[PDB]
Amino acid sequence: KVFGRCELAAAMKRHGLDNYRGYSLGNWVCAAKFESNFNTQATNRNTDGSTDYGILQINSRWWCNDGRTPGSRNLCNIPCSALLSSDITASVNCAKKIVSDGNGMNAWVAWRNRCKGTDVQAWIRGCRL
Ligand SMILES: O=C(O)c1cccc(CN2CCN(CCCS(=O)(=O)O)CCN(Cc3cccc(C(=O)O)n3)CC2)n1
Ligand SMILES: [Cl-]
Ligand SMILES: [Cl-]
Ligand SMILES: [Cl-]
Ligand SMILES: [Cl-]
Ligand SMILES: [Cl-]
Ligand SMILES: [Cl-]
Ligand code: NA
Ligand SMILES: [Tb+3]
Numbered sequence: 001k002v003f004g005r006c007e008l009a010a011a012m013k014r015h016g017l018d019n020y021r022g023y024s025l026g027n028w029v030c031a032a033k034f035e036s037n038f039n040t041q042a043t044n045r046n047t048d049g050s051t052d053y054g055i056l057q058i059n060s061r062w063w064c065n066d067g068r069t070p071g072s073r074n075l076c077n078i079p080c081s082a083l084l085s086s087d088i089t090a091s092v093n094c095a096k097k098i099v100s101d102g103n104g105m106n107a108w109v110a111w112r113n114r115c116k117g118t119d120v121q122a123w124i125r126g127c128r129l
């Protein structure tokens, strides 16, 4: 599924991401934009051999199992394919565990480099939330 901007904002809010660990909804919408371009089926292999899955490009090194990342963990206890579903429940629940780790949303390189410090509120501008 390719979400619309306000569609995804609404979905994230419903699953409890808005202000989760202090991060306003627009931070999550901006991160999704630049991680996946709002496409729940996005996948991208990393140079270390891990792969990033879904709307929030959750990484198999630590968070889900894809059977092809040696030495990795599966801390969200899910197959990585579950993170490609049209329903974002699995991705949100995992993202909550990720952002609860020590680095917050900096674990998302695209958030750090393209959302952090910017006027992220503009990403929910005009949304009927
Ligand atoms: O800054 C940190 O998180 C940091 C610092 C030193 C040591 C640890 C231990 N981590 C390993 C490092 N990985 C952080 C780097 C991830 S990335 O940004 O490079 O991609 C995160 C994976 N961890 C998930 C987790 C779950 C619950 C609690 C904690 C925690 O207390 O750390 N961690 C498992 C153990 N973490
Ligand atoms: Cl915001
Ligand atoms: Cl990740
Ligand atoms: Cl693996
Ligand atoms: Cl392994
Ligand atoms: Cl959904
Ligand atoms: Cl934080
Ligand atoms: Na893994
Ligand atoms: Tb950690």
Ligand SMILES: [Tb+3]
Binding pocket: none
């Ligand atoms: Tb530590």
